[model samples]
Structure formats: C-alpha cells, structure tokens
Target: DIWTPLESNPDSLYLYSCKLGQSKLKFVDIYGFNNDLLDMIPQPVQAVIFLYPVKENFDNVWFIKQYIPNSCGTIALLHLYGNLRNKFELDKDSVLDDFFNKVNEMSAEKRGQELKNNKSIENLHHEFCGQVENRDDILDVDTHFIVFVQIEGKIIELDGRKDHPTVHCFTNGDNFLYDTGKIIQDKFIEKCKDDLRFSALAVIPNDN
Candidate 1:
C-alpha cells in the first residue's frame, strides 16, 4: 500500500512509523538509515502526512524525529498534497446526481457526525453548486466529493472567505466547455484519469 520510495539515504525525505513507548514524540523523520524508531509505534493506524517540497540541501531538512503510539500494527496513511493544476469539468445537475447518491447512503447520524466534525460532504456539494448559480456554466469540481480543498493557492474556508477558484480550466476551440459540454471525444481520455476516484460510493464500498 505504501507507494513512495522508502529508502534511508540522501536526497530523500523519509516518513515512517513506530511503536508508541519506544519513542518519546509521535512522529518519525528519517535522514539516514534508522529502524530503531520505525520498529517502535504502537497501533499507528492513521497518520496525517504533510508533504513538504523536495529540499535542495539538507539544511532545511529536519533531523530524525520519532513518535511512538501504544500499539505498532495500525498504520494508515492520510496524505496531504498540494492542489494540482488540472481541470475536472462537472455539470451542475449531472454531478448533483452523484452527490445525492453519496448523501443518501449515509445515515442521519453519520451526516450529523460529519457536520460536527467539519467534514460535511453534503455542505461541500451544496457550496460548489452555489459557485455556479450566476455563471452560465463552468463550475468548480472541488465543490463535491472533496473533503479538503485549496484552489489556486486560496484555502476555501466555507464562503466567509473568497470562493475556491478554478486551479485549472479547459476549453475547446469553440465556446463549448471542455468535458461537460458537447465535447464527447474527451470522455474516453478523461475516463482514464477519473475512473477510480470518480465512482459511485456503493461500487467502491466502505472498508472501514
């Protein structure tokens, strides 16, 4: 499941896990080969990773840091990466159908829990639709299915702040919108990129 290169050497930023008591802190940083801390985190089930850009010199790199949890087997990766420049043209009513499917699957308790925890997919979906209420077309995709979002360097903090602008937009030679419009040829190409992440929740199923 771990995707990135897991080597303990130069020119790499190493992120690892370990048992809780074995280390004093709760996070581990690897500069060189150090398995002592990695062998140590108790039940490291979930991790919130903040990926920093590749550093040119080791000066900016923080030295080996370690965090140990109570148990060592529960390691899950919660990666946070930058908002890339790419277009996901979602139609208002069409995409809402998908959002409704997800919302319908959740229990009221689950929906309330998400709302209180500040992870409400329902609110986010509605928020995205609001962005396009005025414009004729070309709506932002992050409005739905995006638990967290940063658009064009602006962090969308729910309306009080400025709306999340499009990080990327695509247009054919004509005024027609890229994917959402009459451009049918691009569906196959876009499908290649979106099939996995853009699926019905029932189709994917919940492992948790």
Candidate 2:
C-alpha cells in the first residue's frame, strides 16, 4: 500500500533525478555545516536536502504531502525538483513535466493529493528501492528528510508533511550554500545539537 523508503544517499538520488528526465543536475553530499566545510560544498547549489533525526511530529507552494509511509524520500525529491522546474530544461510530457503541468494551478493540499495519486512516481520510486544498500533496519530509523530552496529571493523550507511552505529570512542569492547551511545550524540543528545523525545533500549543476 506504501513505498519502501529510499536510502539517503546522494549518488542514488542523483541517478533518480536523471531517470526523472532532469539534466545537468547532481545531488552531492554536504559534508557539514561549519563555514569551512560549507566552502567545500559544490557551488551554485539550487537546493539542499536535509535528513535529520526527527524529534517528533512535523512545504512550499509546490509541496506534496507524505501520504504514504516511507514516501518522504520521494516527497522530498518532488519538493526539490518541483520548485525548480525552470532550472532544468525538461523533456516534453516527461514524468515530472506532465505532473507539474497538471498540478501547476492546484492548491497546496490539492497538489499533495495529486502526488499521492500518481502511480508513475510511485512505481519509479519502487524501482529504485533496490539500489539502496543495507536496508535491513531502515524502517526503524527515526530520521526524516526536508528541503531548502532560495525562492523569490528568500529561503524557503519545504517538508511534505507540513501544512505549507514556511518562509525564512530573505537573503541575497549569493552564498546560498553557506547561507542555508547557517540557517539550518542556527534554527533546527541547534534544537538537536547533541544528536550526531544530521545529514544534508546539495543539488547543484552537474560539472561532469
């Protein structure tokens, strides 16, 4: 009835994007949040996917809800790519393009339902489930994935499970990787600073 969870690996996700008909994109692991470590992250990042230890109960205009269990992985990717439809020249009537055009005018919850009812996306994710390694105990994990994108000259937080996209402070587009890194560190990371389970992946133009 639901999807098997995706392993939070950037390489696996980069390929996932390609299969979805996106171009010149790569999802690279963001090593850490410190300024120095931030500099090491690939540049011109379009989005950041943060997978952290969920503390408990917890979107954007392009947001989709986590209607199915373990579907957050697919949901987060939608939150990441759906907002940047223009960034990548998509194939005509492609999986994402067709989905986007259909949901373009829908409200937040409506878009969520559209994604929930989308069988192609469901089947696509299920196809990639086997690429995930060491999946024995994934279902028991408490971590969750959320996304950050600089939209309308402001930082936006998109979590599929949330009611709507929450806006963060406005920032000049420059230094997005660091700016977003700082925000996560100051905002959510600080809340669970003691936990060592935080993870992030940067979505940037594929240099190779």
Candidate 3:
C-alpha cells in the first residue's frame, strides 16, 4: 500500500490548529479542544504535514513507502513553512520543483552538520531516509498530501501543502499534542484549490 507504516488502511487522530512555534504539548485530547490548552491555544496553526522523496523508484511500488525525514515530502513541507519570516504563496505544478530545490539546500546543511554529529545521527538519518525511499514506487497520485510525526502518544510536527499561492504553512510541536489524524485528512481536502483527492491522510504513522 502507498500508506506509510503499511497497515492496509489508516485513520486520522484529531482536528488541528495551525499554531506555529507552539508546542503541541497538552494533557488531554485535542480532537476538539482541551479547556486549559484550548484557551492557551494560539491562532493560525499550520494544519497539515507533508513529505516528499529526494530519491525514489517509481517502478518498484515499495519505494512509495519509504519514510526518510529528509525526503521530498519533508522538504516540501519545509518549503511551505521553513526559512521564510513571512508566508509565501505556492504555485500548483511548481510546488514540487520549488520544494525539490529547498530540499537540496537542507541536504547541504545536513552534510555540513555531518562532521559534528555524524556518528550519532548517521543511523537515525538513514533509517529516516530509507523509510520514505522504500515507499516511493507505489505512492498514489490520487491523494492530497499531508503528514504528521508522532512519538509515543504525542504529535511532534505538522507539515503539508496549501493551495494559497501566497503562503507556505507549517508548524512544529512535540509530544502531548493531540489531534485526530482524521480531521487533518478532511481539512486537507477542503483546503485544496485543485481537485486532488486523498485516499489516505498520513505522512508518518505511529511507530511504537
């Protein structure tokens, strides 16, 4: 299946708010809202997480399941949310190529950092890269892209593309973040300016 974590089918966990820089940290379910965090919640949280493939084998089908953190999906998400102090509009077909270039920049940054924590990060990096590389072959063309990274029971990051040709949307967070993945899927489709239909809504699924 094109879905990462390869489990036949997947379901979303909650509805998300696009609060950039705010930790998704919370004690209760964020599906709707937890009173304490809900009140503390900031506005304009980037609602989706999307990743791409840097290197992929479209023919192998399994390549579509690859889950590298530095892969195309990750880069795409970053382009929409990274480096810019202001939101930039995204062009439709151009988004893929624009993201490709951004990923290249990040890759260079990683290489530069390699000498510092290369030993420790090498294994984790490769594991992250390999997961996405393996899944590229079978990635479905019929889905709106969005991703979420979760550790234990908390959301760590949210990334994805938006139809607005004016801004890239992204937000970073950590565990204790709770939102139904299902809500993300629906919202992604709703926000799409184009008619892309998403069959699944996970960029990364829970690993533990």
Pairs of residues at least 3 apart in sequence or in different chains that clash in candidate 2: 59-164, 59-165
lDDT, candidate 2, residue 147? 91
Ordered from best to worst TM-score, the candidate numbers read 2, 3, 1
Taking the tens digit of each residue's C-alpha lDDT, what string does model 2 give over 1-208? Answer: 5567776777778777677767667888878899788788767888899987661111234667666667788888888778787676666777887888898888767887887888888887877664435554445546677898887677788887777777876776567787888889877888664975788998888865
Best model per TM-score: 2
lDDT of 3 at 174: 31
- Each candidate: RMSD to true structure? 22.8, 4.0, 14.7
- Report the lDDT of model 2 for residue 30: 78
State the lDDT at 195 in candidate 2.
Answer: 70
What does candidate 3's lDDT look like per residue over 1-208, in tens digits? 1223221121211111111121122112232333454334332333334322212111211011123322333333343233221233333334323433434434334523322332322322232322345445335333233444332223333332222122222223432223533344345545556754333222222221
TM-score of 3: 0.24
Candidate 2, residue 86: lDDT: 68
What does the lDDT read for residue 35 in candidate 3? 41
Scored by CA lDDT, what does every candidate get? 0.21, 0.76, 0.30
Residues forming the 10-long window of minimal summed lDDT in candidate 3:
56-65
Top lDDT hit: 2
